[PDB]
Amino acid sequence: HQAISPRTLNAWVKVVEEKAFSPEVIPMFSALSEGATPQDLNTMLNTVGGHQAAMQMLKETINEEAAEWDRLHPVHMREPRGSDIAGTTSTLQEQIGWMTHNPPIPVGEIYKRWIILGLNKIVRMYS
Numbered sequence: 001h002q003a004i005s006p007r008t009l010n011a012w013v014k015v016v017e018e019k020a021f022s023p024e025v026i027p028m029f030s031a032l033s034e035g036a037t038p039q040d041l042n043t044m045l046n047t048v049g050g051h052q053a054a055m056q057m058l059k060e061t062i063n064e065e066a067a068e069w070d071r072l073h074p075v076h077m078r079e080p081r082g083s084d085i086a087g088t089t090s091t092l093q094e095q096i097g098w099m100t101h102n103p104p105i106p107v108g109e110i111y112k113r114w115i116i117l118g119l120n121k122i123v124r125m126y127s
Helices: 006-019 025-032 038-046 052-072 092-100 107-125
Strands: none
Touching: 006 025, 006 038, 025 107, 038 092, 038 107, 052 107, 092 107
16 A cells, blocks of 8 residues: 555646646546555545636545445445445555455445546536
8 A cells, every 4th residue: 555646646737727628637637646655645636726626526426336336236344335445435455455356346446437527417417
């Protein structure tokens, strides 16, 4: 494990500062978030200044994908719930645990895809 680099973080900041939610924000996010844990991805989203309406639409998308995940993965290391993949009810160690398991559950890659789904919807919003 390494925390997402500050360089990575600062690039993401200048990307969003400068492009708001132009469609180019999406390939930049994907390049800058390679191999990220859910916690790292939240650090990235939380460094975003302002844009509270955009951030609200993103959270609603995340919450829908999490509920859909929960609908297809009933309960019974625990298996992650949707909120665990989104990093809001899971610890960093738990995220690393899933990602390095055999077989692995790539919670970072799943959450990144949910975020990209949200960013596509925001892009439809600034357009």
